[PDB]
Amino acid sequence: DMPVERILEAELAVEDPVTNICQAADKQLFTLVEWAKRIPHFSELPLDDQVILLRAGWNELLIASFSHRSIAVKDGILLATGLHVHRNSAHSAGVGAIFDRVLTELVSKMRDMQMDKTELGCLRAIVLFNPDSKGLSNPAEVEALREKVYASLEAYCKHKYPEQPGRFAKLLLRLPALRSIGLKCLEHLFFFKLIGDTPIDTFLMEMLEA
Amino acid sequence: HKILHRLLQD
Numbered sequence: 001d002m003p004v005e006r007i008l009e010a011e012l013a014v015e016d017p018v019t020n021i022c023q024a025a026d027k028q029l030f031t032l033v034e035w036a037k038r039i040p041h042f043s044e045l046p047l048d049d050q051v052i053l054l055r056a057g058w059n060e061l062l063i064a065s066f067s068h069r070s071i072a073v074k075d076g077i078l079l080a081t082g083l084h085v086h087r088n089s090a091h092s093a094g095v096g097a098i099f100d101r102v103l104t105e106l107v108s109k110m111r112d113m114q115m116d117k118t119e120l121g122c123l124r125a126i127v128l129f130n131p132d133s134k135g136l137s138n139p140a141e142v143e144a145l146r147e148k149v150y151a152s153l154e155a156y157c158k159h160k161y162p163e164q165p166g167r168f169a170k171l172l173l174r175l176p177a178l179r180s181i182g183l184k185c186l187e188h189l190f191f192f193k194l195i196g197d198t199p200i201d202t203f204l205m206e207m208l209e210a
Numbered sequence: 211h212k213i214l215h216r217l218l219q220d
């Protein structure tokens with residue numbers, strides 16, 4: 001009903017440093033739409049609810065994506081544009097705190113547990129199927145899809161890593177940190193928009209709309 | 211939300 005194979009397929013189908021980061025974010029919103037279209041039963045929801053889910057979860061989804069991407073590197077983040085932001089660059093641009101939070105609470109833990117792409121895709125699908133999203137035409141259907149995602153995820157974990165009985169819960173317990181970090185990053189984005197001395201592209205700007 | 215709607219419909 002919610003096979004982890006299709007979720008993994010969705011992940012593999014989509015393959016001032018603050019300015020570069022904003023460029024990469026705008027580039028990856030377009031890609032996020034396609035990714036979400038490849039998640040089972042997402043396209044079958046009402047279009048308004050698809051809009052609501054993506055607008056509620058885009059920042060967390062993209063943060064998870066590049067945090068997992070940056071496993072291969074140390075003290076840095078790999079942007080989807082093929083550009084590397086070093087910890088020192090971020091600190092010298094005045095955004096060292098949130099960057100260190102990303103490296104410490106997300107990237108290094110993903111690397112410590114060797115979180116694979118299937119698990120990343122399942123966590124992102126859980127984030128996508130956020131039943132607390134305000135305005136959902138039917139939050140019960142979204143809740144059910146979320147339950148199916150984490151059922152399949154727990155099954156995959158107990159089959160692939162039978163020696164780690166706590167791996168499922170450890171995967172789920174990174175979601176609070178992802179939520180906090182996403183909120184903080186959104187705050188930074190709104191400050192950049194208000195200040196208006198940082199170029200924000202059209203899709204990112206639309207995500208900043210009311 | 212023009213852009214998101216257009217991308218979701220196609």
Ligand SMILES: CCCC1=C(CCC(C)C)/C(=C/C(C)=C\C=C\C(C)=C\C(=O)O)CCC1
Pocket residue numbers: 018021022024025028058059060062063065066077078079080081095098099102185186188189
């Ligand atoms: C620097 C000030 C904070 C800030 C960040 C944090 C970036 C930092 C690495 C913690 C943003 C992150 C978000 C919500 C999305 C980014 C998507 C990308 C970059 C995708 C990709 O490359 O695949 C938006 C701009 C402002």
